[PDB]
Amino acid sequence: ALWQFRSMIKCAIPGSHPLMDFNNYGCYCGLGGSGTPVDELDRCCETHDNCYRDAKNLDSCKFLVDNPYTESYSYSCSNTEITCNSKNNACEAFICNCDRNAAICFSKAPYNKEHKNLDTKKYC
Ligand SMILES: Oc1ccc2c(c1O)CN1C=CC3=C(CC4=C(C3)OCO4)C1=C2
Ligand SMILES: [Ca+2]
Ligand SMILES: [Cl-]
Ligand SMILES: [Cl-]
């Protein structure tokens, strides 16, 4: 679920304000997205958007209001490491893995402050 994604980011990058840092970064971090991502961080976000797109195409999974962000799973954080619980159902596990891979990806990409609040109408 969305709140758990924020909380995953905060596990992978303890020094971070997820909503301040990663919402409205680049072309893809943010509601929707367009064009080509502007750096590796933005591309982490594009991968996350497409991971969600894939989950909605799982004939087996029908998320509340069609948004996988509404779906809560079980995970834990230990020493910077995210573990998705294996007892998550297949749809929960898929979302869990989109969020974990994105948090891990965010933690390894350089953070370019110029791309925060990018003029997307123009650069994306
Ligand atoms: O990184 C993010 C990835 C995407 C999103 C967010 C992120 O910060 C934050 N965020 C906050 C509210 C809503 C969406 C998406 C959506 C809503 C509402 O209703 C329609 O679909 C949303 C997506
Ligand atoms: Ca997005
Ligand atoms: Cl565009
Ligand atoms: Cl759930």
3-state secondary structure of 102: helix
Q: Is 66 known to sit in a ligand binding site?
A: no
The residues assigned a catalytic role are: 48, 99
Q: Separation of 29 CA from ligand 1 center, angstroms?
A: 9
Domains of the chain: 1-124 (1.20.90.10)
Annotation-wise, does 42 bind a ligand? no
Ligand with the closest atom to the CA of 90: 4
Report resolution (Å) to 1 decimal: 2.4
To which H or E segment does residue 5 belong?
Answer: helix 2-12
- Residue labelled with tokens 């998550």: 88
Experimental method, per PDB record: X-ray
Q: 67 in ligand 1 pocket by Cβ < 6 Å?
A: yes
Decide if 64 contacts 45 (C-beta within 8 A): no
Question: How many angstroms separate the alpha carbon of residue 35 from the centre of ligand 4?
Answer: 32
- Cβ-Cβ contacts under 8 Å for 43 (sequence gap 6 or more): 28, 37, 109
